[PDB]
TrEMBL record, chains A, B, C, D, E:
This is TraV. The gene is traV. It comes from the Bacteria.
UniProtKB/TrEMBL annotation, chains F, G, H:
It comes from the Bacteria. This is TraB. The lineage of its organism: Bacteria, Pseudomonadati, Pseudomonadota, Gammaproteobacteria, Enterobacterales. The chain holds residues 194 to 413 of 453 of the full protein. Disulfide bonds join C57-C81.
Amino acid sequence: CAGVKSSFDCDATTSDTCMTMTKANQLARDKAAKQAG
Amino acid sequence: CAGVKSSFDCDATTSDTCMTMTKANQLARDKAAKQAG
Amino acid sequence: CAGVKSSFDCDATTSDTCMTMTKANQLARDKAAKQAG
Amino acid sequence: CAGVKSSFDCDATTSDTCMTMTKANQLARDKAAKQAG
Amino acid sequence: CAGVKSSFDCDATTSDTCMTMTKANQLARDKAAKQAG
Amino acid sequence: KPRFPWISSGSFVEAIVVEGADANASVTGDKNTAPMQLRLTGKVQMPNDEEFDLTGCFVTLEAWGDVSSERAIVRSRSISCKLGDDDIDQKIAGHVSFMGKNGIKGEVVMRNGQILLYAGGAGFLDGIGKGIEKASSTSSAAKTLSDYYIKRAEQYHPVIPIGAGNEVTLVFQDGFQLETLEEARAKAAARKKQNQ
Amino acid sequence: KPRFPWISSGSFVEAIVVEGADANASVTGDKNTAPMQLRLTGKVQMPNDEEFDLTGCFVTLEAWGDVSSERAIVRSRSISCKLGDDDIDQKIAGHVSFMGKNGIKGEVVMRNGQILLYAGGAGFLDGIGKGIEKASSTSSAAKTLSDYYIKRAEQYHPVIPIGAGNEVTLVFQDGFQLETLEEARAKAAARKKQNQ
Amino acid sequence: KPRFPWISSGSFVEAIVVEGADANASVTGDKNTAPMQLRLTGKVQMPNDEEFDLTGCFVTLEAWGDVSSERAIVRSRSISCKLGDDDIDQKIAGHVSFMGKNGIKGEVVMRNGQILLYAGGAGFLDGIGKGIEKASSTSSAAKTLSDYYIKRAEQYHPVIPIGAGNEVTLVFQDGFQLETLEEARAKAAARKKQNQ
């Protein structure tokens, strides 16, 4: 095991959710409508 | 076994259904007629 | 046995039926007359 | 262990807090409003 | 141990006090106001 | 204004792979590629809540393979349309994404089972036979067969099976201006006429 | 004054990755890259308490991989917009940061399990068989298979899976002036006209 | 006199790292660098009891790594401002110091655990197996796996994780004259006009 500390302290990573490219467009659109508000 | 995680998390893949090239054209056409609607 | 899955999922293949080149022309002609109809 | 003293005497280091880039902008803004005062 | 005397006779060294760059500016300023006097 | 609105970079339209192709997935994939063709089935979703109707147009593609990600990296060749009495035939640059990811997901297939088995066997005989000679102490044929069989087996290269009926999304990675054949033909004539 | 305010260097806008791509993360990543596209979902936060509304514009990206940090280092290609009747299509330079850090965080995946196992096995046989010969004292097939299998296994290269639905932040690392297509077209005509 | 007072060499202003970046800390760090951006949060402390208000301006940075001191050596790229109706976009040269020291303090991270373990294991088997053969007296597979695994493991390079929310100090290591975009634009026109 290389000596230097071998761990990031972020934990959070991306999560492939196997969502169709197209459905992501709608997911982006309504969020823009609501998050901006 | 290489150390890095050796698994995708998508699961879904293509499914060769041995459909004739021609029949795919009709399958595309009626879907376009119905999915668009 | 190479690791990757060594099988196609199509099954269907060509079938040499030892038909004379010439007879294939008639087989094409009447099918064109009937399949088109 | 290399002979020379192998220790910094600072102790304090950075602390990745996994904060979204955007939220850091607000964290900078209000501090500027208050720290300057 | 190399033969030549391996010791400085000064003793005094620098002392990282982990002081913020900015606070050093104030520490320099008031000393200039008082040391000069 | 021209009949066709400017198609911007980034737009995407849904599709149904009409022609399935076997992607050459070896070190020389991008040179030795296989043709494959997709038909459009939806309305191009333009960047800002804009939709243009392009249904039934044929798009010709060209594709190779990539074993690391087990996907087929494809590149668009041309787009053909037949609307009203106007025919479209244009070269465009774009890629195809499946399940939210560039390329089409597929498995990797090897047809090396029998040949690789034979190689192993031939010399599995050779080696234990060297130990049989160590026992009888008081291979050339296997070596030659192994060499020939390895030379034959190395010929094969991984293939990605991509078939028909699958649902994909076509992306125009550079924006282009949709134009008709006769209009482009007239333009060519105007440019050649050298209106100085 | 032009309709669009000057976009300065450093500005950032929130986004939703529409197209997911597999980042080639080997020694030649920055040459062999994979396309990927993100849509904007927020208002560009300009440097000093300034906000500009850019919602629904499509940004085309291009990305490779980096195994040391397990992140995908991406570079912007172009930005496309469709507001009112004006279409934007410009080349910009910028990067994308995820969770406060340049690049998008992802895992590293190897598809080498079976091939690397086979190599090990083939010669695990070879070596203990040399000791079996040491015992019977009173491999060529395994060596050839190991060589071929190593040659096949070295082909693969680490991949970073980046998918869709994730939330990222796009940064314009050099400032640019947002301009429309017809306005830029008119400018080009004015520059070519050679107003001496 | 111009609106902006001359910014002299040596001046320092406090900051909050908005964009966190992974510093490439290997022998080729200063060529292969990673972008990172900091926002200003205090008033520039000028050399002699002088203060200038620069709050909310965005500064673009570019950084690499240094393993000997476990710090990220960063270099300023550009500074952008939006005050009133005047936009600033200038190239400046400077560095960033954290906790009184040039660079930002961070740890060193290796993702080599599994690969380096596998190499060790493979041949830990090889060697004791040579001694097992010494015992049975009356490895090739492990060697090949070790070679391949070392070749894969050498690819990785130390990384310095620098995140967001941290507090740093930006230093202008050469003095510059703060100027607006239109004013610089007018100057460029005056210089090009060739007032001979």
